[PDB]
Amino acid sequence: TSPVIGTPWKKLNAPVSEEALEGVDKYWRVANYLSIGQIYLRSNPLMKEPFTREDVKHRLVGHWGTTPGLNFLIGHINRFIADHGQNTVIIMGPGHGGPAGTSQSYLDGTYTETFPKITKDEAGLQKFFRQFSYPGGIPSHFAPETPGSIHEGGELGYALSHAYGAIMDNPSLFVPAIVGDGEAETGPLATGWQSNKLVNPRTDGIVLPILHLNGYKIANPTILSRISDEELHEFFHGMGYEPYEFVAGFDDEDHMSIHRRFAELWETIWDEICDIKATAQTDNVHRPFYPMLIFRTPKGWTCPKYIDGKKTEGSWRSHQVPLASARDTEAHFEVLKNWLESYKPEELFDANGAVKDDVLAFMPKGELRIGANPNANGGVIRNDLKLPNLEDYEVKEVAEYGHGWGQLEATRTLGAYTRDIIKNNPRDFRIFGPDETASNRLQASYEVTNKQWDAGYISDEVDEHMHVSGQVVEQLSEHQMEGFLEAYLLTGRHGIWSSYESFVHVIDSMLNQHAKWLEATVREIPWRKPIASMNLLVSSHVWRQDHNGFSHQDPGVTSVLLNKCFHNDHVIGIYFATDANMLLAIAEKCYKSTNKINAIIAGKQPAATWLTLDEARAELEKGAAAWDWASTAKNNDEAEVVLAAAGDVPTQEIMAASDKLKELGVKFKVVNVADLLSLQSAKENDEALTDEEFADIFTADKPVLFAYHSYAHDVRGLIYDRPNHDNFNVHGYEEEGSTTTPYDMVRVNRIDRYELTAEALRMIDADKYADKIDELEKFRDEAFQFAVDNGYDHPDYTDWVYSGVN
């Protein structure tokens, strides 16, 4: 679970010391200098004679506009941390404020600790400035390469979901969450403000949202800075916050008055938070209004007010670089030089180029430093789950009655397994869902926990399984669920969320950003320890969406996740749960895995159970497997056709087609694919099937009929250099469907058992089986006409049991 770090929720009981404020003002100057040096300078960091245009980088990359505001806030937060011993993680929402994050880590000493070549002297400072956003250096954003980041904030709008995920079951953790005022215009951010209705001030930590109201986004004003101050305050009060406003930099107040004013307001806010935390030790049934800070400052604060007659400080014109080419004109170089000198670096750095002791003597030390807090490197906190014994949940009836027995709902099995994970791993495992946990059949967890709800309660007739604390969280937002879980994992804990398949697409871009985090971490950031995997139960899938119908039918999550499978990163798992015993095997592998995004595509409809758990674990280790109990070919040369399937509904239709083929005497081989990346090119993926293993399973030369759960294009693209790939005939979802019966869903997508039987006969000999082929095609129209007439599927479809069942 989360470590208790420091002395949390302590009031100061004194004014902020004038010395600490002189610390904060020097911090802001030197962090601003170091932010500018990283953007503009390739050499001569301390502007020794001669400082000329040759010291300027040839291409200016990075963002000034948000940066001096972030440096201000970070300076004051560091003072706060050292004075109070508070366990603190910062969410840098305007993540293009990269130079502030790297400057912080350089000043707190964690940068040189982590990156020993970047020393705390003039040659290390030169390397520090050159490397920023440079070929072979470090990124422009607050990337996972930076000590202290858990959030790159490249794609905007997840700051608050990540902040609130971080504090769940983390009652000593304080998260100051800096939100762009442009970022507050996004969808995901806008709903993220309501997360305070889903956290509990006793059992969870505290988020302080900080609205970086600098007035501007890239080229536009921001909505929230142009509405009235009364509207802006009512808005935050309507969302359960008590808003505090700070305004600075729009007049000629000296910088030391600003710091005193801010430290006074910070400590007032903090006294309000400590009151909330102290009250919650007794009463955590009544939701407080949490503080939030509206930080109103000019964009690009302390850049030159006018460059070439255009307003730059307090404008969108300061967003990227205020000064656009200091290398090309003497005039513009002089502006850069005077700007760099306005921070007076002669007082900040000593003769050797180290930042002076009195600049940083207010800073926190040890694990309380922003770049050294374990919650910001949450792999160091994370332990293996205590997992229950997987055979306790095994469907034993396959071994009793035969492969293909029963009408179980496979996700109920996962639900019972996850219930006992939650029971064995209190405060360490969570379930998230967008109001779909019961619907996706995971509600056995309510026997051991509750849905965390901190809005109003009204009646025990409606409010079953809800409590102000609990390990299940539901809000109708895929962005919230994915974002909560992502930060729960990045801070060292574990979990799962579930979703209807077609709505996974809502968070495709969040999955992309989590995968780029993971890809960069496993390629090049070894000091960042492995975090628990992002586990996604994909249920209510396309084949059993014949009640919501056509516009809820999109299995396309698989195509998205296949674009993050390169260079042996192995950060993606794509798993088709064939039945409940395969779902168990998959779930245990995903629950033991680290540094991944695991998609688990499982049906929740009643379906057969095909495998025992020991067979499921064997198929899962390779990824695909022949089912010799289902083949009537007895090796690869007497097979006429290979019937392969990936997914529970393709497996059902292929197994029903193999029974009709067997009745015709045909010699075939049956294959199941549980793990989709096992089919990936053996050159590209060293966990995938070797080409010899692939040709034993599939064959060297026989026609393979392949029923696939998602778009056939996924498979055709993956097997492009596999042996015998020209003989594959992939059937997937093909954008057909309506609100209809289950048979009609498989029929219109050409994956029903009769079409698959017919396709196998056309592949073997379309001419000797011509009579029986015309017979199967006529039945397809007749079983559809039965559904129209009677209101339910034809009994040859619905009553079918595999002949292996005794």
Ligand X SMILES: Cc1ncc(C[n+]2csc(CCOP(=O)(O)OP(=O)(O)O)c2C)c(N)n1
Residue 152 is a binding residue for a second copy (CB under 8 A): yes
Neighbours of 672 (CB within 10 A): 28
Q: Cβ closer to a second copy: 404 or 647?
A: 647
Tokens of 73: 């806030």
Cα separation of the two ends of the chain: 48
Binding-residue total with a second copy (CB under 8 A): 131
Phi, psi (5° rounding) for residue 564? Answer: -115, 30
Site pattern 173..202 for a second copy (x: CB under 8 A): ---------xx-xxxxxxx-xx--x-----
Nearest Cα residue to 413 out of 543, 592, 604, 591: 604
Neighbours of 218 (CB within 10 A): 11
Residue 176 is a binding residue for ligand X (CB under 6 A): no
Tokens of 78: 């560091």
Candidate residues 4, 123, 361, 476; the one interacting with a second copy per rule CB under 8 A: 476
Give the footprint of Ca ion on residues 164-223 (CB under 5 A): 181-182, 214
Stretch that binds ligand X, among 174-182, 268-276, 334-342, 513-521 (CB under 6 A): 174-182
CA distance 482 to 486: 6
Give the footprint of ligand X on residues 479-518 (CB under 6 A): 503, 506
In three-state secondary structure terms, 434 is coil
* Smallest separation (angstroms) from a second copy to the CB of 243: 10
Q: Under a CB-based contact definition with an 8 Å cutoff, are residues 598 and 533 in contact?
A: yes
Residue 204 is a binding residue for a second copy (CB under 8 A): no
Give the footprint of ligand X on residues 267-306 (CB under 6 A): 299
Candidate residues 227, 256, 476, 618; the one interacting with ligand X per rule CB under 6 A: 476
Site pattern 12..51 for ligand X (x: CB under 6 A): ----------------------------------------
Q: Which does 65 bind (CB under 5 to 8 A by kind): Ca ion, a second copy, ligand X, none?
A: ligand X
Dihedral sign for Cα 100, 104, 106, 112, please: negative
In three-state secondary structure terms, 343 is coil
Candidate residues 155, 272, 397, 684; the one interacting with ligand X per rule CB under 6 A: 155
Q: Cβ closer to ligand X: 66 or 680?
A: 66
CA distance 71 to 77: 10
Candidate residues 18, 117, 123, 220; the one interacting with a second copy per rule CB under 8 A: 220
Residue number of the CB closest to ligand X reads: 180
Residue 435 is a binding residue for ligand X (CB under 6 A): yes
∠ Cα 547 550 552 (to 5°): 75
Candidate residues 66, 302, 533, 741; the one interacting with ligand X per rule CB under 6 A: 66
Stretch that binds a second copy, among 364-372, 375-383, 515-523, 762-770 (CB under 8 A): 515-523
Q: Cβ closer to ligand X: 112 or 509?
A: 509
Tokens of 689: 């099937």
Phi, psi (5° rounding) for residue 374? Answer: -55, -30
Residue 156 is a binding residue for ligand X (CB under 6 A): yes
Write the burial class of residue 795 (CB in 10 Å: 0-12 exposed, 13-18 middle, 19+ buried): exposed
Q: Cβ closer to a second copy: 36 or 626?
A: 36
Dihedral sign for Cα 401, 405, 408, 414, please: positive
Candidate residues 8, 45, 62, 65; the one interacting with ligand X per rule CB under 6 A: 65
Residue 122 is a binding residue for Ca ion (CB under 5 A): no
Stretch that binds a second copy, among 9-17, 355-363, 453-461, 583-591 (CB under 8 A): 453-461
Q: Which does 429 bind (CB under 5 to 8 A by kind): ligand X, Ca ion, a second copy, none?
A: none
Candidate residues 3, 85, 154, 304; the one interacting with a second copy per rule CB under 8 A: 154
CA distance 74 to 288: 26
Q: Cβ closer to ligand X: 181 or 409?
A: 181
Sequence-ordered list of residues with C-beta below 8 angstroms from that of 4, at least 6 positions apart, any chain: 87, 171, 172
Candidate residues 126, 302, 502, 578; the one interacting with a second copy per rule CB under 8 A: 502
Q: Cβ closer to a second copy: 59 or 634?
A: 59
Q: Under a CB-based contact definition with an 8 Å cutoff, are residues 176 and 260 in contact?
A: no
Stretch that binds ligand X, among 18-26, 54-62, 77-85, 175-183 (CB under 6 A): 175-183
How many angstroms from the chain centroid is the CA of residue 117?
A: 32
Tokens of 216: 């501007």
Nearest Cα residue to 447 out of 431, 436, 433: 431
* Side chain identity, residue 79: R
Residue 213 β-bridge partners: 296
Buried b (16+ CB within 10 A) or exposed e, 602-612: bbbbebbbbbb
Residue 562 is a binding residue for a second copy (CB under 8 A): yes
Give the footprint of ligand X on residues 346-405 (CB under 6 A): none
Residue 739 is a binding residue for a second copy (CB under 8 A): yes
Give the footprint of ligand X on residues 86-125 (CB under 6 A): 94, 96
Q: Cβ closer to ligand X: 157 or 737?
A: 157
Q: Cβ closer to Ca ion: 72 or 694?
A: 72
Sequence-ordered list of residues with C-beta below 8 angstroms from that of 354, at least 6 positions apart, any chain: 120, 121
Q: What share of the chain is helix, strand, coil (3-state, %, to 5)?
A: 45, 15, 45
Residue 720 is a binding residue for a second copy (CB under 8 A): yes
The reply to whether omega before 703 is within 30° of 0 (cis) is no
Residue 79 is a binding residue for ligand X (CB under 6 A): no
Residue 162 is a binding residue for a second copy (CB under 8 A): no
Q: Cβ closer to Ca ion: 157 or 182?
A: 182
CA distance 295 to 247: 6
Candidate residues 13, 14, 49, 135; the one interacting with a second copy per rule CB under 8 A: 135
Q: Which does 57 bind (CB under 5 to 8 A by kind): a second copy, ligand X, Ca ion, none?
A: a second copy
* Smallest separation (angstroms) from a second copy to the CB of 483: 10
- Strands 429-433 and 451-452, bridge-based pairing: unpaired
Stretch that binds a second copy, among 236-244, 370-378, 536-544, 605-613 (CB under 8 A): 236-244
